[PDB]
Amino acid sequence: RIDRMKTEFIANISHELRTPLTAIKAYAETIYNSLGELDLSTLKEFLEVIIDQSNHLENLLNELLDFSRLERKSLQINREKVDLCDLVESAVNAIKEFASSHNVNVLFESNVPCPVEAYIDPTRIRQVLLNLLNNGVKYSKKDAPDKYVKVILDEKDGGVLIIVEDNGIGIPDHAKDRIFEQFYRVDSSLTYEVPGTGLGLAITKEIVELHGGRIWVESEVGKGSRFFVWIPKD
Amino acid sequence: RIDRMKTEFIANISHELRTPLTAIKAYAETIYNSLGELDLSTLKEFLEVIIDQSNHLENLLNELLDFSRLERKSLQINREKVDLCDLVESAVNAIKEFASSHNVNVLFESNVPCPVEAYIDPTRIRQVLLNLLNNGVKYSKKDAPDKYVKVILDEKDGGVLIIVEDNGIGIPDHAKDRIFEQFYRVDSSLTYEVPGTGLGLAITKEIVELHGGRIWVESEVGKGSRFFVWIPK
Amino acid sequence: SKKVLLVDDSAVLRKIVSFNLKKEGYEVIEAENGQIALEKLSEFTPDLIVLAIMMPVMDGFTVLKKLQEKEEWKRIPVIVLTAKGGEEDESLALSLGARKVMRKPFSPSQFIEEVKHLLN
Amino acid sequence: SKKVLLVDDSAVLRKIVSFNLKKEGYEVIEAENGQIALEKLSEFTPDLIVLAIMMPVMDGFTVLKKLQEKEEWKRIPVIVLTAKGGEEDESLALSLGARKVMRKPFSPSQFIEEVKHLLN
Ligand SMILES: Nc1ncnc2c1ncn2[C@@H]1O[C@H](COP(=O)(O)OP(=O)(O)O)[C@@H](O)[C@H]1O
Ligand SMILES: Nc1ncnc2c1ncn2[C@@H]1O[C@H](COP(=O)(O)OP(=O)(O)O)[C@@H](O)[C@H]1O
């Protein structure tokens, strides 16, 4: 945490939350003003938008709160036996709508046959997978016909190795050692419109560290990125 | 200021925004799943709640953004001739609903005759008044029959002196020197439930000091507080 | 019909929870804070308490504690409905005798499912 | 009827603005980014452009600039509808030839009133 990044962070919160809020307010006022003109199908559709936008706003508030808890060291890991193939598939399903809105195909491969058990907190590792999958969509290419994010599952070094691969914008070399820092976002002409706080990867790192794991990145600008998460098996 | 306050600040954002969001989501889902069980007045009422809660959330986002702009030094002020009597009455009206929800009476006196003309940015001084009025409501006494926030307008020292007085919880001596700092909140048994970021008075201080003015406080714990804003005329 | 004591400092929150409870035919008694909630127990005995945490005058943790300390109050099931979603906050609430902790923001339909479960 | 070019990267926002524009009898052509918006000016000439700022491929400031370069495009009135609500942001947009800047979140009724004013 430094002062320039903190000021930038505060502005970034406002803008990221303002987008769903705008939809909530516009849809709600439109319903209120147009009850005599709205058919039932459209009324239901508009209420669904309010609910779905509220859910996205909720997730962004959960990010802020989980980060504060990690900074306080109050966030608690509770491990159990979980099938990673089921966990990844559930995460892939959860991101499908958002991925479709940016024309990004979401894939899942496994080098090892399923199932693959691991002694891990399912909610927190789900949150790790969703952050990496979200980033794969957010930082995808701007105009390409073959955009994708792929989760590759494998066993290695007495643990589970998860690789989240994309063919997105990639990360420059000076940024690679800073992307996991709290509040850090790459400032370039390919990231100006992308909403974000710079908290996602800091949270992901912390959660991975609390499992006795590590996270690292390989990337080439213009080609894409591979995020590697290693976590012990038992 | 410091890093421990930054962490508390981030948690405080989450909680203050979570309250209106809870209403938005609960009301929207209720309408969606109860279309056959809602009369027209209740449907309209529930939609109005969504709209009003969205507006409060919007105001909380505007606070965050105005603070960032003040820290960037990108927030320009634009002065003009404004009647402060009309401006104060407008701010008093804007907070009446919130004040009623906490049983706080909002008063306005003027020690000089109206109109009180002054060369100021009307929207930014309204924002100063709303922050002080909001605080008077937020930090009012917990259970009392005579709770108030009063704006007193006066002319002094070649300028306008605005006093926002309350009979709320008051502010202890060690805290008085720190309440205008960014992220600072008095952490006590009388503030635990009150939502806030600690930005309001930091924003107010900078808006006032961009006008060439100053802001200071007098307070007694258990009695109440008086915030003084002096602006050149 | 079943009687629910609804304890929260937000009128807007109480309105929407009350509406959903009354959809199921339940009677609803409201309290704006923890102290008022305990005062209302002198008038009647509810079948369920829906309790917030962050309230003025008396918070929900204090309410939970006070409920366990009185013979006639400690068997009334309590559902904590709160924005304080942390794991330590939940553990404290459950350790103080709450039957269930549900986070805000909440799904009204999921909330009513859980209210049904505890009432039956 | 009057034709409106609606330029924004959010499908959700385009849907609600389009609904309100079609309530007044206006035709609506949508563009997902600035480049697509300028591409669609080859097939028709709108009576109003509703323009966001933060879009991929081509942002709204670049669109405003490019609208002034051609004499055909320079005359089309533009309302900027944006979350970028700062005074410096507004001044730039107006200096680039925008007729009006409206902030998000917005009131759909106030938006339509301003659309009517510029069209009439
Ligand atoms: N898959 C990716 N491709 C390219 N850049 C990425 C990717 N994931 C993360 N980044 C970069 O790392 C930064 C930090 O990521 P994160 O911590 O998730 O914060 P945010 O997404 O809110 O900016 C991003 O701003 C982005 O510049
Ligand atoms: N009228 C008042 N009475 C008592 N305390 C106050 C009053 N106004 C402000 N304070 C104290 O000063 C702190 C900072 O106020 P402010 O900057 O508006 O932040 P916030 O209201 O978000 O906490 C508050 O947390 C509160 O402890």
Residue numbers in the entry:
A (entry chain B): 246 to 479
B (entry chain A): 246 to 478
C (entry chain C), D (entry chain D): 2 to 121
Tell me, in the authors' exact words, what the paper reports.
TCS are composed of two main players, a sensor protein called histidine kinase (HK) and an effector protein called response regulator (RR). The HK catalytic core is comprised of an ATP-binding domain (CA domain) and a phosphoacceptor domain containing the phosphorylatable His residue (DHp domain). RR activity is controlled by the phosphorylation of a conserved Asp residue located at the N-terminal receiver domain (REC domain).
Additionally, we confirmed that the absence of the sulfate ion in HK853H260A was due to the loss of the His260 imidazole group by solving two additional structures comprising wild type HK853 in complex with RR468D53A (HK853–RR468D53A) at pH 5.3 and 7. In these two structures, His260 presented a gauche− rotamer and was coordinating a sulfate ion in a similar position to that observed in the other complexes. In these two structures, RR468D53A also showed the presence of the sulfate ion at the catalytic center in an identical position to the one observed in the HK853H260A–RR468D53A structures and so had acquired the phosphorylated conformation. Oppositely, the structures support that the gauche− rotamer of His260 should represent an inactive resting state for the His awaiting to sense RR binding for phosphotransfer or P-RR for dephosphorylation, albeit independent of pH. In this resting conformation the phospho-His would be stabilized by a network of contacts with the phosphoryl group which are mimicked in our structures by a sulfate ion.
